[PDB]
Symmetry: C2
């Protein structure tokens, strides 16, 4: 399995190396035939090549089977031309691979219900995967405009756009608890009804997965009242943008969440947290998100679901045994990693 | 003060009479010059006149200074032509009075943090008022359509639409903690930027109120993480629809929430709960929402803020002293009401 590693800035190199230690560990244990190469990306790239996404890196992601991203950005590059900002290189990466779906999981690990803003009774068992459509919708819809007296934006969706995001959700659900919930506003909007119709049609080719439909406003209530009753949730751009964020607060710590973007090209797996440059090089950076991105990679890029679950149970234990500083512990990056490996056998 | 009372169906007459007992009580205590008359509305109206919103009632709301609504609807009328359904009469009512703003408060009464799905630490102190634009937006935007291959809906807003809803929020904030937060998606949508610009302009005439802007997706996280730090929240139709529902789960019981619709005409105050016909006539119906709608009426329709707060503190105590059956108590409608009156002196 070929993996393109883009460490990035700040704590990127530390947390990414933590994930590689787990991957290499598994490779020796199962002979995965893991082959990887690190490439410049982000600020490091701007400083070394002048562009956040240099061509050798573009070639690297093109030839790779998966991308393990670290963290990009930093105050140092914020005051630069947009076309060359680290954030831009990130957008370019997604375009080059035609990644149309964004996977954002939110789970409350056993024993960590205390961190959730929700009552332990309700926070317990949460394990939801929000699949958000990234390319279409109101964010890119036309016509759009603004004048001194009015403003307009269009929520538009074509059948192919809905069909493809819907497919990654079903395919993604088979790997989990085989239950998908499609969110829309069908009872008021034409786009909603169209979205509902299409997903219901698409589902016919997935008899082993159960499909359910819900209105965005109702789903917002459910995520706070009974988030644990959901598995895979698929929805539009703006709807998925709101819902992903809502669900992300559930665990009570942004530092533990990974994410992935799927499409026609090479998949991208990355931790949701920033680069935290002021902590770079001290150790202490919580590698959880990075290791979980490694797990996401195994599951979605290579189908090694059982191995992904193994790494997941490993970090879960690690969090309780040697809590990272952010969870009130004192275990540095290496310390935490060691514990994870300790449970990877 | 002239009040038009529309009891409605199910528990409507019981809970509305509970609110009237409080109002009449206050009238004797402060000589408010309260004058009211009940009119048919809802199913009762269909059964007696053939239409859910008969003309004598239309004249009644036109001549009244406020409307105290009970509860409409019931399985009995669900299988009827849309034009004559109780739900329709409700829509007609809002149109006749050009009510463009919907006020939906969500508060966790002291001692009742236990019912919230949020941790007591975070549920404590919550008292938010969501002001939602009702007439414009994507729900009514054009062009809109659908074909075998595509679907589109338009989020459109004209300056006057934004200006008016914004004004009820500032005016509504002065009566509370003088802090308004305008929600939008300005960083991505033209409509967002336009909405932000207009509200910022409108705020200039309200120097005594503090204005803050927030992105809908960020606001979704805040309502779960730190809802207590907000006072008045104003936003668009679809955004307010989602946010009102999110905030409504915060208290942990739909039966305690009132609501109001403001505009050019006679204001409408009504409890959010259904008609619960299977309980009609047994007593036991929790009058909290109705009494709180009476309080909302005093505050928004007549400006008697201090009296509204008095009724609010009354029910708050009542909930702890003689909890309604829904809160695990056994106090029936009359019992609960008596306790409220007991604290209204």
């Amino acid at each position: 399995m070929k993996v393109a590693v883009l460490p990035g800035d700040g704590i990127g190199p530390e947390v990414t190396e933590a994930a590689l230690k787990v991957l290499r560990a598994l490779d020796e244990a199962e002979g995965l035939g893991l082959a990887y190469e690190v490439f410049p990306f982000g600020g490091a790239a701007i400083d070394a090549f002048g562009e956040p996404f240099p061509e050798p890196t573009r070639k690297g992601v093109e030839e790779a089977e998966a991308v393990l991203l670290g963290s990009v950005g930093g105050p140092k590059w914020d005051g630069l031309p947009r076309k060359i900002r680290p954030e831009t290189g990130l957008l370019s990466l997604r375009k080059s691979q035609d990644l149309f779906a964004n996977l954002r999981p939110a789970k409350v690990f056993p024993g960590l219900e205390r961190l959730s803003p929700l009552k332990e009774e309700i926070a317990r068992g949460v394990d939801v995967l929000i699949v958000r459509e990234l390319t279409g919708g109101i964010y890119f819809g036309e016509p759009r405009g603004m004048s001194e007296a009015e403003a307009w934006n269009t929520e538009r969706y074509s059948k192919p756009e809905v069909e493809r995001v819907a497919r990654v959700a079903f395919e993604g659900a088979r790997k989990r608890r085989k239950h998908v919930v499609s969110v829309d506003k069908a009872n008021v909007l034409e786009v909603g009804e169209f979205w509902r119709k299409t997903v219901e049609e698409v589902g016919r080719g997935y008899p082993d997965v159960a499909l359910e439909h819900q209105y965005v406003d109702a789903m917002a209530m459910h995520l706070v009242r009974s988030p644990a009753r959901f598995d895979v949730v698929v929805t539009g751009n703006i709807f998925g943008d709101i819902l992903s964020d809502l669900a992300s607060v559930l665990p009570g710590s942004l530092g533990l969440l990974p994410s992935a973007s799927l499409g026609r090209g090479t998949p991208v797996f990355e931790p949701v947290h920033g680069s935290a440059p002021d902590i770079a090089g001290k150790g202490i950076a919580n590698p959880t998100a990075a290791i979980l991105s490694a797990a996401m990679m195994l599951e979605h890029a290579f189908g090694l679901v059982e191995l992904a679950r193994k790494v997941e149970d490993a970090v879960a234990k690690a969090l309780l045994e040697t809590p990272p500083p952010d969870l009130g512990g004192s275990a540095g990056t290496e310390a935490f990693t060691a514990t994870v490996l300790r449970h990877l056998a």
